[PDB]
Enzyme design. Sequence first.
Site, PDB file in Angstrom:
ATOM      1  N   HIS A  43      57.848  56.614  23.941  1.00 32.15           N
ATOM      2  CA  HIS A  43      56.800  57.421  23.326  1.00 32.15           C
ATOM      3  C   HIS A  43      56.080  58.265  24.367  1.00 32.15           C
ATOM      4  O   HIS A  43      56.167  58.023  25.569  1.00 32.15           O
ATOM      5  CB  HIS A  43      55.813  56.540  22.537  1.00 32.15           C
ATOM      6  CG  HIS A  43      54.796  55.850  23.388  1.00 32.15           C
ATOM      7  ND1 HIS A  43      53.468  55.768  23.043  1.00 32.15           N
ATOM      8  CD2 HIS A  43      54.924  55.163  24.552  1.00 32.15           C
ATOM      9  CE1 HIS A  43      52.815  55.092  23.970  1.00 32.15           C
ATOM     10  NE2 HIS A  43      53.679  54.702  24.892  1.00 32.15           N
ATOM     11  N   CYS A  97      50.094  56.960  28.713  1.00 35.19           N
ATOM     12  CA  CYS A  97      50.425  55.548  28.667  1.00 35.19           C
ATOM     13  C   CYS A  97      51.084  55.155  29.979  1.00 35.19           C
ATOM     14  O   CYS A  97      51.839  55.948  30.560  1.00 35.19           O
ATOM     15  CB  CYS A  97      51.351  55.248  27.492  1.00 35.19           C
ATOM     16  SG  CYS A  97      51.846  53.534  27.382  1.00 35.19           S
ATOM     17  N   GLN A 115      50.796  48.527  16.990  1.00 34.82           N
ATOM     18  CA  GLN A 115      49.846  48.979  15.983  1.00 34.82           C
ATOM     19  C   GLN A 115      50.607  49.527  14.784  1.00 34.82           C
ATOM     20  O   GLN A 115      51.659  50.161  14.933  1.00 34.82           O
ATOM     21  CB  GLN A 115      48.900  50.038  16.544  1.00 34.82           C
ATOM     22  CG  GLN A 115      48.025  49.544  17.675  1.00 34.82           C
ATOM     23  CD  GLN A 115      46.981  50.569  18.116  1.00 34.82           C
ATOM     24  OE1 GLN A 115      46.665  50.680  19.299  1.00 34.82           O
ATOM     25  NE2 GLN A 115      46.390  51.268  17.152  1.00 34.82           N
ATOM     26  N   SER A 138      44.983  54.190  19.825  1.00 36.70           N
ATOM     27  CA  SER A 138      45.122  54.613  21.219  1.00 36.70           C
ATOM     28  C   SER A 138      45.074  56.124  21.372  1.00 36.70           C
ATOM     29  O   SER A 138      44.650  56.621  22.422  1.00 36.70           O
ATOM     30  CB  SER A 138      46.418  54.081  21.837  1.00 36.70           C
ATOM     31  OG  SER A 138      46.728  52.791  21.365  1.00 36.70           O
ATOM     32  N   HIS A 141      50.763  59.902  19.242  1.00 39.49           N
ATOM     33  CA  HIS A 141      52.066  59.590  19.815  1.00 39.49           C
ATOM     34  C   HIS A 141      53.137  60.550  19.300  1.00 39.49           C
ATOM     35  O   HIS A 141      53.090  60.979  18.146  1.00 39.49           O
ATOM     36  CB  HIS A 141      52.499  58.158  19.456  1.00 39.49           C
ATOM     37  CG  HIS A 141      51.466  57.099  19.707  1.00 39.49           C
ATOM     38  ND1 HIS A 141      51.530  56.235  20.780  1.00 39.49           N
ATOM     39  CD2 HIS A 141      50.323  56.790  19.044  1.00 39.49           C
ATOM     40  CE1 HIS A 141      50.494  55.412  20.746  1.00 39.49           C
ATOM     41  NE2 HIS A 141      49.744  55.728  19.704  1.00 39.49           N
TER      42      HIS A 141
HETATM   43  N1  LIG Z   1      49.764  52.687  24.819  1.00 36.28           N
HETATM   44  C1  LIG Z   1      50.331  52.210  23.635  1.00 36.28           C
HETATM   45  C2  LIG Z   1      51.609  51.636  23.643  1.00 36.28           C
HETATM   46  C3  LIG Z   1      52.179  51.160  22.475  1.00 36.28           C
HETATM   47  C4  LIG Z   1      51.468  51.254  21.295  1.00 36.28           C
HETATM   48  C5  LIG Z   1      50.192  51.804  21.280  1.00 36.28           C
HETATM   49  C6  LIG Z   1      49.615  52.297  22.440  1.00 36.28           C
HETATM   50  C7  LIG Z   1      49.678  51.777  19.870  1.00 36.28           C
HETATM   51  O1  LIG Z   1      50.564  50.881  19.202  1.00 36.28           O
HETATM   52  C8  LIG Z   1      51.808  50.829  19.894  1.00 36.28           C
END
Ligand SMILES: Nc1ccc2c(c1)COC2
Length: 147
Positions: A43, A97, A115, A138, A141
Amino acid sequence: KLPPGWEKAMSRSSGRVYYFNHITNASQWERPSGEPARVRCSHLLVKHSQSRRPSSWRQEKITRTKEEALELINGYIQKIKSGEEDFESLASQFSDCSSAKARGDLGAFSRGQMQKPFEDASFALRTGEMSGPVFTDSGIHIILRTE
Ligand SMILES: Nc1ccc2c(c1)COC2
């Protein structure tokens, strides 16, 4: 009729049908093609001032508005779709991230770990497919399903 999440729509500027997925926010001109315990995704996360932690490895204090973060997301999608940029180069350079250091890769995961909006989009993607903007606490994405 169509795979999970997909609906027909009409383009406002051109008048041609397109296909939109309300789970992944994907949209494309072609009719979609054709659940596993686990999927693997990468992502690209763009954080904003209302993110749950408005801080990243790129910026100690993230101040951009939600709307500005969506514009950034929309721009990265355009460059990925046009082929000017690979999803990986943009994730490594610009994702808020810590997974940026791994070209955005999060590894494999099952339902119940991420999430919910991220999880739903990830499992509605087909292998190789990419989401539109996906909203979580967060930030926003772009998701690429790799396995
Ligand atoms: N930083 C980050 C990485 C993975 C996820 C989220 C944030 C929200 O849910 C999945």
